[PDB]
Design an enzyme around this catalytic site. Structure first.
Site, PDB file in Angstrom:
ATOM      1  N   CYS A 109       0.838  -1.189   0.000  1.00 34.94           N
ATOM      2  CA  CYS A 109       0.000   0.000   0.000  1.00 34.94           C
ATOM      3  C   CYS A 109       0.877   1.243   0.000  1.00 34.94           C
ATOM      4  CB  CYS A 109      -0.909   0.057   1.245  1.00 34.94           C
ATOM      5  SG  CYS A 109      -1.824  -1.433   1.715  1.00 34.94           S
ATOM      6  N   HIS A 132       0.556   4.967  -1.640  1.00 38.55           N
ATOM      7  CA  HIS A 132      -0.118   5.909  -0.753  1.00 38.55           C
ATOM      8  C   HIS A 132       0.807   6.607   0.243  1.00 38.55           C
ATOM      9  CE1 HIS A 132      -4.292   5.034  -1.891  1.00 38.55           C
ATOM     10  NE2 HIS A 132      -3.914   3.770  -2.017  1.00 38.55           N
ATOM     11  N   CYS A 171     -27.395  -7.408  13.916  1.00 38.07           N
ATOM     12  CA  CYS A 171     -28.578  -6.713  14.438  1.00 38.07           C
ATOM     13  C   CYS A 171     -29.857  -7.146  13.764  1.00 38.07           C
ATOM     14  CB  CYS A 171     -28.422  -5.178  14.293  1.00 38.07           C
ATOM     15  SG  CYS A 171     -26.937  -4.494  15.165  1.00 38.07           S
TER      16      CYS A 171
HETATM   17  C1  HEC Z   1     -32.876  -3.888  20.168  1.00 41.80           C
HETATM   18  C2  HEC Z   1     -33.510  -5.220  20.192  1.00 41.80           C
HETATM   19  C3  HEC Z   1     -31.932  -3.549  19.028  1.00 41.80           C
HETATM   20  C4  HEC Z   1     -32.222  -3.406  17.719  1.00 41.80           C
HETATM   21  C5  HEC Z   1     -33.536  -3.588  16.997  1.00 41.80           C
HETATM   22  C6  HEC Z   1     -31.013  -2.961  17.073  1.00 41.80           C
HETATM   23  N1  HEC Z   1     -29.964  -2.872  18.002  1.00 41.80           N
HETATM   24 FE1  HEC Z   1     -28.128  -2.243  17.669  1.00 41.80          FE
HETATM   25  N2  HEC Z   1     -27.622  -2.642  19.546  1.00 41.80           N
HETATM   26  C7  HEC Z   1     -28.442  -3.130  20.542  1.00 41.80           C
HETATM   27  C8  HEC Z   1     -27.712  -3.297  21.785  1.00 41.80           C
HETATM   28  C9  HEC Z   1     -28.293  -3.796  23.076  1.00 41.80           C
HETATM   29  C10 HEC Z   1     -26.463  -2.900  21.535  1.00 41.80           C
HETATM   30  C11 HEC Z   1     -25.268  -2.821  22.460  1.00 41.80           C
HETATM   31  C12 HEC Z   1     -25.373  -1.550  23.444  1.00 41.80           C
HETATM   32  C13 HEC Z   1     -25.294  -0.307  22.729  1.00 41.80           C
HETATM   33  O1  HEC Z   1     -24.201   0.294  22.670  1.00 41.80           O
HETATM   34  O2  HEC Z   1     -26.294   0.166  22.159  1.00 41.80           O
HETATM   35  C14 HEC Z   1     -26.405  -2.472  20.156  1.00 41.80           C
HETATM   36  C15 HEC Z   1     -25.273  -1.923  19.540  1.00 41.80           C
HETATM   37  C16 HEC Z   1     -25.235  -1.441  18.241  1.00 41.80           C
HETATM   38  C17 HEC Z   1     -24.096  -0.808  17.627  1.00 41.80           C
HETATM   39  C18 HEC Z   1     -22.752  -0.585  18.285  1.00 41.80           C
HETATM   40  C19 HEC Z   1     -22.568   0.789  18.963  1.00 41.80           C
HETATM   41  C20 HEC Z   1     -21.211   1.119  19.306  1.00 41.80           C
HETATM   42  O3  HEC Z   1     -20.267   0.348  19.117  1.00 41.80           O
HETATM   43  O4  HEC Z   1     -21.006   2.294  19.850  1.00 41.80           O
HETATM   44  C21 HEC Z   1     -24.460  -0.451  16.387  1.00 41.80           C
HETATM   45  C22 HEC Z   1     -23.645   0.253  15.335  1.00 41.80           C
HETATM   46  C23 HEC Z   1     -25.827  -0.900  16.213  1.00 41.80           C
HETATM   47  N3  HEC Z   1     -26.293  -1.491  17.367  1.00 41.80           N
HETATM   48  C24 HEC Z   1     -26.541  -0.746  15.036  1.00 41.80           C
HETATM   49  C25 HEC Z   1     -27.839  -1.195  14.825  1.00 41.80           C
HETATM   50  C26 HEC Z   1     -28.525  -1.073  13.565  1.00 41.80           C
HETATM   51  C27 HEC Z   1     -27.933  -0.422  12.307  1.00 41.80           C
HETATM   52  C28 HEC Z   1     -29.744  -1.658  13.743  1.00 41.80           C
HETATM   53  C29 HEC Z   1     -30.842  -1.849  12.733  1.00 41.80           C
HETATM   54  C30 HEC Z   1     -30.404  -2.836  11.619  1.00 41.80           C
HETATM   55  C31 HEC Z   1     -29.812  -2.065  15.115  1.00 41.80           C
HETATM   56  N4  HEC Z   1     -28.617  -1.812  15.777  1.00 41.80           N
HETATM   57  C32 HEC Z   1     -30.929  -2.628  15.728  1.00 41.80           C
HETATM   58  C33 HEC Z   1     -29.815  -3.407  20.389  1.00 41.80           C
HETATM   59  C34 HEC Z   1     -30.521  -3.288  19.193  1.00 41.80           C
HETATM   60  C1  HEC Z   2      -0.760   1.645  -6.594  1.00 42.04           C
HETATM   61  C2  HEC Z   2      -0.427   0.450  -7.456  1.00 42.04           C
HETATM   62  C3  HEC Z   2      -1.658   1.356  -5.402  1.00 42.04           C
HETATM   63  C4  HEC Z   2      -1.475   0.452  -4.421  1.00 42.04           C
HETATM   64  C5  HEC Z   2      -0.358  -0.536  -4.244  1.00 42.04           C
HETATM   65  C6  HEC Z   2      -2.565   0.630  -3.489  1.00 42.04           C
HETATM   66  N1  HEC Z   2      -3.428   1.647  -3.920  1.00 42.04           N
HETATM   67 FE1  HEC Z   2      -5.057   2.337  -2.993  1.00 42.04          FE
HETATM   68  N2  HEC Z   2      -5.374   3.610  -4.512  1.00 42.04           N
HETATM   69  C7  HEC Z   2      -4.611   3.769  -5.649  1.00 42.04           C
HETATM   70  C8  HEC Z   2      -5.191   4.780  -6.531  1.00 42.04           C
HETATM   71  C9  HEC Z   2      -4.595   5.173  -7.852  1.00 42.04           C
HETATM   72  C10 HEC Z   2      -6.285   5.228  -5.915  1.00 42.04           C
HETATM   73  C11 HEC Z   2      -7.309   6.288  -6.324  1.00 42.04           C
HETATM   74  C12 HEC Z   2      -6.877   7.757  -5.865  1.00 42.04           C
HETATM   75  C13 HEC Z   2      -7.789   8.808  -6.187  1.00 42.04           C
HETATM   76  O1  HEC Z   2      -7.594   9.969  -5.743  1.00 42.04           O
HETATM   77  O2  HEC Z   2      -8.801   8.615  -6.925  1.00 42.04           O
HETATM   78  C14 HEC Z   2      -6.375   4.496  -4.634  1.00 42.04           C
HETATM   79  C15 HEC Z   2      -7.358   4.722  -3.679  1.00 42.04           C
HETATM   80  C16 HEC Z   2      -7.474   4.089  -2.442  1.00 42.04           C
HETATM   81  C17 HEC Z   2      -8.462   4.420  -1.448  1.00 42.04           C
HETATM   82  C18 HEC Z   2      -9.502   5.551  -1.601  1.00 42.04           C
HETATM   83  C19 HEC Z   2      -8.712   6.924  -1.402  1.00 42.04           C
HETATM   84  C20 HEC Z   2      -9.358   8.199  -1.443  1.00 42.04           C
HETATM   85  O3  HEC Z   2      -8.719   9.272  -1.512  1.00 42.04           O
HETATM   86  O4  HEC Z   2     -10.630   8.233  -1.409  1.00 42.04           O
HETATM   87  C21 HEC Z   2      -8.239   3.573  -0.391  1.00 42.04           C
HETATM   88  C22 HEC Z   2      -8.958   3.471   0.931  1.00 42.04           C
HETATM   89  C23 HEC Z   2      -7.093   2.750  -0.756  1.00 42.04           C
HETATM   90  N3  HEC Z   2      -6.636   3.096  -2.008  1.00 42.04           N
HETATM   91  C24 HEC Z   2      -6.519   1.773   0.049  1.00 42.04           C
HETATM   92  C25 HEC Z   2      -5.417   0.993  -0.282  1.00 42.04           C
HETATM   93  C26 HEC Z   2      -4.846  -0.026   0.583  1.00 42.04           C
HETATM   94  C27 HEC Z   2      -5.348  -0.372   1.965  1.00 42.04           C
HETATM   95  C28 HEC Z   2      -3.807  -0.577  -0.077  1.00 42.04           C
HETATM   96  C29 HEC Z   2      -2.904  -1.687   0.400  1.00 42.04           C
HETATM   97  C30 HEC Z   2      -3.689  -3.024   0.581  1.00 42.04           C
HETATM   98  C31 HEC Z   2      -3.703   0.143  -1.355  1.00 42.04           C
HETATM   99  N4  HEC Z   2      -4.707   1.094  -1.478  1.00 42.04           N
HETATM  100  C32 HEC Z   2      -2.706  -0.089  -2.310  1.00 42.04           C
HETATM  101  C33 HEC Z   2      -3.424   3.046  -5.917  1.00 42.04           C
HETATM  102  C34 HEC Z   2      -2.872   2.063  -5.122  1.00 42.04           C
END
Ligand code: HEC
Ligand code: HEC
Ligand code: HEC
Lengths: 134, 261
Positions: free
Chosen positions: B76, B80, B222
């Site tokens: 990477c 990058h 979830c």
């Molecule tokens: C109740 C039965 C829930 C429903 C429906 C959904 N989630 Fe949930 N989620 C629940 C608990 C008890 C927990 C852990 C405690 C908490 O931090 O809320 C979670 C956690 C998440 C998280 C992580 C939050 C963090 O790391 O800070 C995410 C991102 C999350 N839940 C997303 C999520 C989504 C997108 C749902 C709809 C598809 C969803 N949850 C439903 C309980 C419940």
């Molecule tokens: C050259 C041969 C590359 C190698 C090796 C890796 N990446 Fe790359 N990456 C490359 C290009 C030409 C581009 C597009 C740049 C642009 O401005 O359009 C990217 C882009 C990404 C992105 C999105 C970046 C952004 O600005 O939005 C990500 C997250 C990314 N690349 C990740 C990534 C990782 C984790 C690599 C190692 C496994 C990696 N790249 C290698 C070219 C090249």
């Protein structure tokens, strides 16, 4: 003889006046079903001090038999939404209308018939338990 | 506590409470990091990378960043530069519309595009450990920067699809994300303290399973846990849901990898 999901007589307030089965409810089993994470899992949302780590999403069920009639408590269990429109409490005796229902927690879609989250007897067992909460 | 400040390593200020984004203002008085719902003991684990077991995987990915992989013999870093510069800011603005794709893309999709088309290396499984460690390294170098995902313009239809999913009841338990995280945040489901379900701290290191957890892995679980059928990881549906949920946290700082239950 149990009244099947499609057939429960439901008044305008969501109350259900007659038991869902002719078998008497066993409150001891009712107690177990409520804390059975695999069946009622009720403690996820509800405290019952008579009975660890209850949720607080729903109200404490302490006293529920002193404040609500049996028919109302049963109505809450058959389809909570008839009683509390738009509640988050699950509908334990519904088998239709779900979006993307899965087989328990296996992520697989339910194909063929959908069974209710609890049976008529499980519900009357739970109702019988709740009725001890005076 | 909920209103205590989060600083990381003594160096990085994290905004953990912020005014509610305009699109969500009807629903919350303020938006909050999941960190603010954790006990003091767990909160402390995110305050020092030495105590954050998620950062062990990040340090491994720092080495991967410099390691040539694939038929093209490149790492990477060869394109990058140092990860701290080349990835700076990126976590805060994805998912975003990507010019080359004519679509909203996630960081994971971008990484796999470089792996295959530029490195000649195997794709990483979308929610697997290799991908999730690299996404955590990318998040880690933007910690403290405000999440700032665009919700309009070419991203609008995607954001709207995600909003629709967020408020759709799923499963036999018949619950939407909002059922728990909007209506009942700050309440408890059993011993778990419900947060607003924000993703500004992802990938999260969960003390429960002692690994990093990808956003789409959380989302899958979830919907599964409504007794439902989740969408596929990397699916248009979860790309949309991720853009939308990310926008529910606009203004909170990038926190990943965070420590959570
Ligand atoms: C109740 C039965 C829930 C429903 C429906 C959904 N989630 Fe949930 N989620 C629940 C608990 C008890 C927990 C852990 C405690 C908490 O931090 O809320 C979670 C956690 C998440 C998280 C992580 C939050 C963090 O790391 O800070 C995410 C991102 C999350 N839940 C997303 C999520 C989504 C997108 C749902 C709809 C598809 C969803 N949850 C439903 C309980 C419940
Ligand atoms: C050259 C041969 C590359 C190698 C090796 C890796 N990446 Fe790359 N990456 C490359 C290009 C030409 C581009 C597009 C740049 C642009 O401005 O359009 C990217 C882009 C990404 C992105 C999105 C970046 C952004 O600005 O939005 C990500 C997250 C990314 N690349 C990740 C990534 C990782 C984790 C690599 C190692 C496994 C990696 N790249 C290698 C070219 C090249
Ligand atoms: C959270 C997802 C719940 C689960 C699981 C169960 N219940 Fe519930 N219940 C819940 C709420 C949010 C409410 C209040 C209504 C509202 O939507 O605001 C209730 C209410 C009840 C009641 C009535 C009590 C009262 O109003 O004082 C009863 C008798 C009841 N719930 C029973 C019950 C049982 C037996 C459950 C396991 C099968 C159960 N609930 C699960 C939320 C949730």
């Amino acid at each position: 003889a149990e009244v099947a999901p499609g057939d429960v007589a439901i008044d305008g307030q969501g109350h259900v006046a007659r038991p869902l089965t002719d078998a008497p409810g066993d409150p001891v089993e009712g107690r177990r079903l409520m804390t059975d994470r695999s069946v009622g899992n009720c403690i996820a949302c509800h405290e019952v001090t008579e009975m660890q780590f209850p949720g607080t999403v729903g109200p404490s069920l302490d006293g529920v038999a002193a404040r609500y009639p049996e028919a109302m408590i049963r109505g809450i269990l058959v389809n909570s939404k008839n009683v509390f429109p738009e509640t988050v409490m699950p509908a334990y005796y519904r088998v239709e209308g779900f979006n993307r229902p899965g087989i328990a927690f296996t992520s697989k879609p339910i194909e063929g018939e959908i069974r209710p989250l609890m049976t008529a007897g499980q519900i009357e067992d739970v109702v019988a338990y709740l009725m001890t909460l005076t | 506590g909920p209103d205590d400040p989060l600083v990381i390593n003594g160096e990085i200020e994290i905004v953990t409470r912020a005014p509610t984004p305009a699109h969500l203002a009807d629903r919350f008085d303020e938006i909050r990091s999941g960190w603010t719902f954790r006990t003091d003991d767990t909160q402390a684990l995110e305050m020092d990378d030495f105590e954050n077991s998620g950062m062990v995987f990040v340090e491994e990915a720092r080495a991967v960043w410099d390691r040539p992989e694939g038929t093209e013999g490149k790492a990477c870093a060869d394109c990058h530069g140092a990860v701290d510069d080349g990835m700076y800011g990126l976590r805060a603005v994805y998912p975003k519309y990507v010019e080359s794709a004519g679509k909203v893309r996630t960081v994971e999709q971008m990484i796999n595009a470089c792996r295959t088309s530029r490195m000649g290396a195997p794709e990483w499984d979308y929610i697997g450990p290799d991908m999730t460690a690299m996404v955590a390294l990318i998040a880690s170098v933007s910690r403290g920067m405000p999440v700032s995902v665009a919700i309009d313009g070419p991203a609008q239809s995607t954001w709207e699809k995600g909003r629709e999913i967020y408020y759709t009841r799923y499963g036999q338990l018949d619950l939407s994300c909002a059922s728990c995280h909007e209506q009942y945040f700050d309440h408890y489901i059993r011993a778990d303290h419900l947060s607003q379900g924000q993703i500004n701290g992802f990938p999260s290191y969960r003390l429960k399973n002692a690994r990093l957890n990808a956003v789409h892995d959380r989302f899958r679980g979830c919907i599964r846990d409504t007794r439902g059928v989740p969408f596929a990881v990397g699916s248009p549906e979860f790309v949309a849901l991720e853009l939308y949920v990310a926008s529910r946290g606009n203004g909170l700082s990038v926190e990943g990898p965070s420590v959570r239950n």
